[PDB]
Design an enzyme around this catalytic site. Structure first.
Site, PDB file in Angstrom:
ATOM      1  CG  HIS A 453     -10.986 -42.990 106.332  1.00  0.00           C
ATOM      2  ND1 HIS A 453     -10.841 -41.634 106.103  1.00  0.00           N
ATOM      3  CD2 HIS A 453      -9.789 -43.557 106.040  1.00  0.00           C
ATOM      4  CE1 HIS A 453      -9.587 -41.406 105.711  1.00  0.00           C
ATOM      5  NE2 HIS A 453      -8.940 -42.563 105.626  1.00  0.00           N
ATOM      6  CG  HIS A 491      -7.239 -38.083 106.093  1.00  0.00           C
ATOM      7  ND1 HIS A 491      -7.805 -37.042 105.380  1.00  0.00           N
ATOM      8  CD2 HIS A 491      -6.845 -39.028 105.192  1.00  0.00           C
ATOM      9  CE1 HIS A 491      -7.678 -37.317 104.096  1.00  0.00           C
ATOM     10  NE2 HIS A 491      -7.119 -38.556 103.968  1.00  0.00           N
TER      11      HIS A 491
END
Ligand SMILES: Cc1cc2nc3c(=O)[nH]c(=O)nc-3n(C[C@H](O)[C@H](O)[C@H](O)COP(=O)(O)OP(=O)(O)OC[C@H]3O[C@@H](n4cnc5c(N)ncnc54)[C@H](O)[C@@H]3O)c2cc1C
Ligand SMILES: *[C@@H]1O[C@H](CO)[C@@H](O[C@@H]2O[C@H](CO)[C@@H](O)[C@H](O)[C@H]2NC(C)=O)[C@H](O)[C@H]1NC(C)=O
Ligand SMILES: *[C@@H]1O[C@H](CO)[C@@H](O)[C@H](O)[C@H]1NC(C)=O
Ligand SMILES: *[C@@H]1O[C@H](CO)[C@@H](O)[C@H](O)[C@H]1NC(C)=O
Ligand SMILES: *[C@@H]1O[C@H](CO)[C@@H](O)[C@H](O)[C@H]1NC(C)=O
Ligand SMILES: *[C@@H]1O[C@H](CO)[C@@H](O)[C@H](O)[C@H]1NC(C)=O
Ligand SMILES: *[C@@H]1O[C@H](CO)[C@@H](O)[C@H](O)[C@H]1NC(C)=O
Ligand SMILES: CC1(C)OCc2cc(C=O)ccc2O1
Length: 512
Positions: A453, A491
């Protein structure tokens, strides 16, 4: 929310090989990178204006293992031959990693988890967001490609575990990033079909949107009142092409945390001293291009249950302010999925395993992107994250690793122990098990992986204004994960899918 349905490739009717010279010419908008932000942006701008979306990768139909949940491991296991949807890299920290090279970008290769940004994120940024519009834009994405996942036995175990370990409250099924344990949305449907940013191109106007694939954008072209006016891109045979914007139009860079700063530096937008030292002519000095590049740490243990567990995609999240935890259950393999483990010398599992993980929020540690080649965009830039250079991140991994300890001690997980002993040494581990504070610090430092990420390199407030414009340059914007220094949630695909359309809507409004 979306239904179960096949992956919608209708948009291929306006997708062309970049070898086609008839794509060259003037457009209202040029979007660089057909990824998470870039696809919804190009689709949104195409409602009113002529848009060219340029993507260096090919179409996902070329790599069928990108279109199912079951295929996730395959794309990481596959060798990087320069054409594959997964591009391998190693940070200068020594940690193995990947980025997407395909139309749909990282939404075509990722783990499918869908969440909305922490509702506190907007006010933390100080950008004057249209919050009603943000939410309508979340629904536009979610209607298209997000489902409520069905029950998976491992995810239900892990959810029971998180709740028993004190990760409260029980939030049930929710897309929101909030403290406690929840089932979140997925971009894998209930039949295991992957849905992705490329399907948002189906929301574009087919009379106005053109997509070039195997289009490597090598340079942003500028005016001699400094404006972006166009791009140079090369095709799969190596021939060069030019496209331009016209009138009140704009070039948007959506090439990701790695690709956006790379293309800006190659185009002479970047630190004067750095660019000068490479004999790259400075078009716009900015000391922050490729600076403030972040990678949230992943720390993990692996358990090998004495009876088989069913493989699952992650749907159940355990959220605190200081750590975000999940677990996947996996079949064994003899070819490692590249970057699942931080190096290629990690021991292989030969029975089913649970990968149980914690993510450091932020993070506060940062590094940079620098050019490896001063001319060739196909040569990957250098990237360094400086994992745990900031003590706060190490403190947060310690707290996360203590909570994974609590999780391994739950009644929920007790059936997955090899020996019915009182302690967590009752589990069989693949690799290093959990171990005062110094032993957890060593474990955090020594066993870190990428969460994948990564973000930053073209920050709002450093490179961009609050409208995502490159400061000092007309008709140039950046919209992708390069834009924010802290994760919007656990996320972030949901946030970046939303951001593509939202910024497209702000561009259409500014112009009306
Ligand atoms: C393996 C993996 C798993 C992940 N799992 C999840 C998860 O389950 N849920 C979640 O929320 N997040 C997940 N993430 C993170 C999330 O998917 C990404 O942060 C997000 O998709 C990034 O979007 P982006 O638009 O910035 O980049 P991208 O989606 O990568 O788009 C950039 C595009 O630009 C193209 N490009 C680059 N340079 C050029 C150039 N010069 N010319 C032309 N095209 C160019 C690329 O090929 C790419 O298609 C995962 C990431 C990875 C790598
Ligand atoms: C959602 O984001 C908000 C704001 O970034 C976080 O709230 C902050 O959390 C820290 C640590 O708890 C506090 O000391 C700050 O003062 C909080 N700020 C505000 C404005 O409330 C919050 O932790 C994030 N939530 C989750 C669950 O990740
Ligand atoms: C584009 O055309 C070339 C032939 O000139 C071919 O090698 C390549 O595979 C094509 N790419 C796509 C994405 O169709
Ligand atoms: C946006 O939706 C969220 C849930 O995702 C809700 O908490 C919030 O109040 C909404 N905000 C506005 C302005 O409607
Ligand atoms: C930059 O060009 C000058 C010649 O003008 C040369 O002296 C110097 O070594 C060059 N530096 C690089 C890194 O190319
Ligand atoms: C290019 O990347 C390699 C890894 O192949 C690195 O070791 C090398 O020093 C880099 N070169 C430059 C100029 O950054
Ligand atoms: C860590 O990050 C914080 C926030 O940026 C910063 O104040 C501090 O300088 C950094 N701390 C350390 C230990 O370097
Ligand atoms: C949490 C995380 C990273 O999600 C995805 C995942 C996939 C596999 C299969 O290769 C194995 C472990 C795993 O764990």
């Amino acid at each position: 929310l979306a239904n179960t349905s096949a992956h919608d490739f209708s948009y291929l009717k306006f997708v062309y090989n970049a070898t086609d010279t008839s794509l060259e010419g003037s457009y209202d908008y040029i979007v660089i990178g057909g990824g998470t932000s870039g696809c919804p942006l190009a689709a949104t701008l195409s409602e009113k204006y002529k848009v060219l979306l340029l993507e260096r990768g090919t179409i996902a139909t070329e790599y069928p293992n990108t279109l199912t949940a079951d295929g996730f491991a395959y794309n990481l296991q596959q060798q990087d031959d320069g054409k594959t949807p997964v591009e391998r890299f190693v940070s200068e920290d020594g940690i193995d990693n990947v980025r997407a090279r395909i139309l749909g970008g990282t939404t075509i290769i990722n783990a499918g988890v869908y969440a909305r940004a922490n509702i506190s994120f907007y006010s933390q940024t100080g950008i004057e967001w249209d919050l009603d519009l943000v939410n309508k834009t979340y629904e536009w994405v979610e209607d298209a490609i997000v489902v409520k996942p069905n029950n998976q036995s491992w995810q239900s175990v892990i959810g029971e575990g998180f709740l028993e370990a004190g990760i409260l409250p029980d939030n049930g099924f929710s897309l929101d990033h909030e403290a406690g344990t929840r089932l979140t949305g997925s971009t894998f449907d209930n039949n295991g079909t992957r849905h992705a940013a490329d399907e948002l191109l189906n929301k574009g106007d087919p009379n106005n949107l053109l997509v070039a694939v195997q289009a490597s954008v090598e340079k942003i072209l500028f005016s001699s009142n400094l404006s972006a006016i166009g791009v140079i891109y090369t095709d799969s045979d190596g021939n060069s092409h030019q496209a331009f914007v016209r009138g009140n139009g704009e070039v948007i860079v959506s090439a990701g945390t790695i690709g956006t700063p790379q293309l800006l530096l190659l185009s002479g937008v970047g630190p004067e001293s750095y660019l000068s030292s490479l004999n790259i002519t400075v078009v716009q000095p900015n000391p922050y291009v490729g600076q403030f590049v972040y990678d949230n740490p992943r720390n993990f243990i692996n358990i090998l249950p004495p009876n088989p567990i069913e493989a699952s995609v992650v749907t159940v999240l355990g959220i605190r302010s200081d750590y975000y935890q999940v677990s996947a259950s996996s079949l064994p393999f003899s070819t490692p999925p590249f970057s699942l483990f931080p190096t290629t010398s990690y021991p292989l599992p030969n029975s089913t395993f649970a990968h149980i993980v914690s993510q450091v929020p932020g993070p506060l540690s940062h590094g940079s992107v620098t050019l490896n080649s001063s001319s060739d965009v196909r040569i990957a830039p250098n990237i360094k994250f400086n994992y745990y250079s900031n003590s706060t991140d190490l403190a947060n991994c310690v707290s996360g690793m203590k909570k994974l300890g609590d999780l391994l001690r739950t009644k929920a997980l007790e059936p997955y122990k090899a020996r019915d002993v009182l302690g967590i040494d009752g589990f069989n581990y693949l690799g290093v098990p959990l171990p005062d504070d110094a032993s957890f610090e060593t474990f955090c430092l020594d066993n870190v992986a990428s969460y994948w990420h990564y973000h930053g390199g073209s920050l709002v407030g450093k490179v961009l204004d609050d409208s995502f414009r490159v400061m000092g340059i007309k008709a140039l914007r950046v919209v992708d994960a390069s834009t924010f220094p802290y994760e919007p949630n656990s996320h972030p695909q949901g946030f970046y899918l939303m951001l593509g359309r939202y910024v497209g809507l702000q561009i259409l409004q500014e112009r009306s």
